Paper text:
The rotating flagellar filament primarily functions as a propeller, acting as an Archimedean screw, and supercoiling of the filament is essential as rotations of a straight filament do not generate thrust. Here, we show the atomic cryo-electron microscopy structures for flagellar filaments from enterohemorrhagic [name] O157:H7, enteropathogenic [name] [name]:H6, Achromobacter, and Sinorhizobium meliloti, where the outer domains dimerize or tetramerize to form either a sheath or a screw-like surface. A shared feature in all four structures is the formation of symmetrical homodimers between the outer domains of [name] subunits, with one outer domain rotated 180° relative to the other. These symmetrical dimers are the result of outer domains being able to adopt either an “up” or “down” conformation.
A 6.7 Å resolution volume was reconstructed asymmetrically where all [name] subunits could be fitted into the density. Analysis of this low-resolution structure revealed the seam, which involves the lack of D2 dimer formation between two [name] subunits. This seam is a consequence of a reduction of symmetry along the 9-start helices of a flagellar filament composed of dimeric [name] such as EHEC H7. The two outer domain subunits in the seam still form Sn:Sn + 22 dimers in domain D4. However, rather than forming an Sn:Sn + 6 or Sn:Sn + 11 dimer in domain D2, the two-seam subunits form Sn:Sn + 5 dimers with each other similar to those forming the EHEC H7 and the Achromobacter ODSs. In the non-helical perturbation model, subunit pairing introduced a seam causing a discontinuity in the helical lattice, much as such a seam or discontinuity exists in microtubules.
Residue numbers in the entry:
A (entry chain B), B (entry chain A): 3 to 548
The structure:
Amino acid sequence: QVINTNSLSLITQNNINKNQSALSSSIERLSSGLRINSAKDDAAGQAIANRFTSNIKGLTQAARNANDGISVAQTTEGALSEINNNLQRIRELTVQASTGTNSDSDLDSIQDEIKSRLDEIDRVSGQTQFNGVNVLAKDGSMKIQVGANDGQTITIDLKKIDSDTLGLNGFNVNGKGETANTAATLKDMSGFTAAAAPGGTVGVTQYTDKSAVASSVDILNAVAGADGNKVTTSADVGFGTPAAAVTYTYNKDTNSYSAASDDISSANLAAFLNPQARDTTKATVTIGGKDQDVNIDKSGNLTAADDGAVLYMDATGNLTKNNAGGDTQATLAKVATATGAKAATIQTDKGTFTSDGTAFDGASMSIDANTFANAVKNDTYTATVGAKTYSVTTGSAAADTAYMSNGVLSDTPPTYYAQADGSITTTEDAAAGKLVYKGSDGKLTTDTTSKAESTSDPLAALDDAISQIDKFRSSLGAVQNRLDSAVTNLNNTTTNLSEAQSRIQDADYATEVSNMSKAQIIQQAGNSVLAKANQVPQQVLSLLQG
Amino acid sequence: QVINTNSLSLITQNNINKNQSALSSSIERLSSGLRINSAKDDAAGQAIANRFTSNIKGLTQAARNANDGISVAQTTEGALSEINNNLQRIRELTVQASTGTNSDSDLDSIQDEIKSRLDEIDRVSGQTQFNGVNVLAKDGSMKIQVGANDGQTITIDLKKIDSDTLGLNGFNVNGKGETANTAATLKDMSGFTAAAAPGGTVGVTQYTDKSAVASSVDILNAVAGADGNKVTTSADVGFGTPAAAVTYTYNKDTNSYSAASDDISSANLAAFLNPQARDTTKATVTIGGKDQDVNIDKSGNLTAADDGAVLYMDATGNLTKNNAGGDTQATLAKVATATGAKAATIQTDKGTFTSDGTAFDGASMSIDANTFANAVKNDTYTATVGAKTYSVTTGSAAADTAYMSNGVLSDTPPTYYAQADGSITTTEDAAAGKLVYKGSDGKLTTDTTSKAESTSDPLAALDDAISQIDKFRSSLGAVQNRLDSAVTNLNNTTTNLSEAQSRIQDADYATEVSNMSKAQIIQQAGNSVLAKANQVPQQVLSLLQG
């Protein structure tokens, strides 16, 4: 009974408006097929779906990468298998070649063919490549990404395999083999004669090969060869040049000989620490509880270890370091007596030094071996070796008690005894002695055999190469099995995660068709009731009778 | 008969007003489709509908959660199946390798592949994940919400599965396999404490393991192991028992220690040459340029080296040896002064001897090493080794400068530095040090591996590991079926509750359309009767006749 200013059709319109959102959402949900289409839905679901999608894509790419790794491992394994076949053939040839019934032509032919197959192995090692990467040319590792998160990879170990790595660097089966050596040749013994015969046997004559006097450098090599020997010398370069003390003993412990000397170097620091005309050395000086780092050059200015800081000596009565003192300029000469008075130390890397008075007392010097030999090659010394004492006085073998053996220094010359029957034996009694032989190198070596230039133990070396290649092949096989397992895992995981993500997205149409029917029926009923509502007002017109 | 002041239409308007509310309610109900739209209807019904709606939504979301739990269980089960297959292959390989017809190379290959697959098991254990959650990395539990009200959950048990948990920590069938060692374990360092920190770093504390003082016998094996060392000792058995001279130095050259001593053994030959109570030793005596062979027993009769010839000492004025002399009987005491006066030698195999006066001068003695060690185990000596000097005074490590390292004697004790972060390093600066480890043996070795003898009953251990993983698989299966049953129950319950809530809301349209029709018809009737009511009054105007 009101003029449309309180009409009830507004309620119907509002209800239709409330329905329209559900209608639109239902139709759109049918169209997409995914429950979550924008942030208006459960945004947490959207984020979880996005994370799941990223995981699934990364997992699939990782699976493809693992397959690629399997392929590269397969190529490498095939190459290794044929290399193994070649090595087995070479071993078979070597087994053939060991028989003594073969002429030098036969051995040469076998060597030619073996060299051919070794070059074949080298070639196939260099040749094999997989997409610009040489599998067998370098001892690297290859990382295979099979996981979604960074840092999770599988490593394939690759070794450089060739003739050098497998060994034998030229198998060389064709060298001149086992050869019998020639006899004693009594006439060749032109050494010093002596009928001493300490056993008194009338039928033996002792021959000594003199002129084997070792040189001084030989003495130095002998002492340097062994570790832990003793050498006493005077008149050394740098330290010991005044030679106030003679017994230094140089304390050879592990490496280039050390030393120990009393107050002798006071002015020799520049000569020692600066071998050349412009050398400068780092050193550490402390007064006691005050560790300061300094540079020493030609016994001149004690330049501070800073970039360009220059230290000045000051503090008369204390004699410490200060960059900004107000007295005379610092030099090594006076700081020597300063340290002697204050009982400090100036120890450096190549020698720990202290002073009492006006001269440095060396403690733990360490002179270079080559320089030491160059300095004392022509002076007197009593260098000793294990359980032996050797004397040298301004000339090699002053006492004439050092003799050069085959390769070692001995106090006794090579003694050769000549027997009555023309043989030469190392000892008087023929029951012992191992009658000496001659041949192919001189020096009258006491063996019946000359070294054969062929490979020493060919079969063992070839079996070692076979073992190496088979270990490599086993490594590749284990890696291949592990990658196959990784692929199976990653497939199962990506399937499960795909279903998981499907449970969050991907709205069930079974519910959505019924929801659409709801929305459409409500919309139709609402529009019709809106019509029925707006057909009401004209009753007031009917009342007016106009 | 009244002019609108007692109007008869008022009841008509009032009745139309009453029915208008019903008409509007019917139209609105038809538009919405729900029986209750606001509190004007049965409010208790509205509250009940709200509660049912909340319950239905909660149950649906719980069903989705249950599905997610099923998916994660499936992924875990797949990973466990892969691990189980790997373990089966390990068992098969172990059964193969138990046979005694195999060489060390075959065992090496088998152990290599077993180790490879064990590392594969560990990798698949570590890298398996479900949406940022590692199922097999911890012994945790995951709660799945399947109910509408808080606290109603289902728990899934997860166990940490890896090579450590299953046991055997390196299956190690071949031998010389590797097991991981433990960490620094700062708390175990019970050695002597020293905050000295020579580098001055505040955060470093130096710990030294004291009580590592080597015994004197340890020094003896230390000196004896190396060849050519120096040992200075007095108060020795036999030679040096009077200890007239102290600096012997024992001249170790190649083997059991030698010696060099002045005239001290004059009467000590009987004890020294005859360690037991009746021993006899052969000897060679020469009065110069002319050798004679003799036997010595307890300094008594100088029996000739013949079968039974007995030598007596003779020749006053020359002091010769005659097997047919004509003077008094021979004793070593008398021949001692004979040789001392006449400058002869009695050099033997185990010692070169001469005498001047009435006492023998030893030159090239050779004492047995074991007898030496037993003799000087509890006396003062200053034995030295390569470039080192050691002092002992009536007791092991008198100077307290001897410390027993891992296997060698060093002048410095074992130095361990503990870092601020709880790590223990061999050096103060963390850049170096090779952070120390422990494990399986103590002694704090700087190794990541400690050996382990193969196993006891390998197949039993593999079987127990299989049983563990199989039990885990069964547990996951029981839980997974649990969740399937829960999903079925939730679906049935939410369907029933949805049908329940629908029966309270959702007004029957069958009665509602009839209500609309009745309201509309009665409304038109009311409007028309209102018009007819308004058509009545003008009969009074008809009365007025104007």
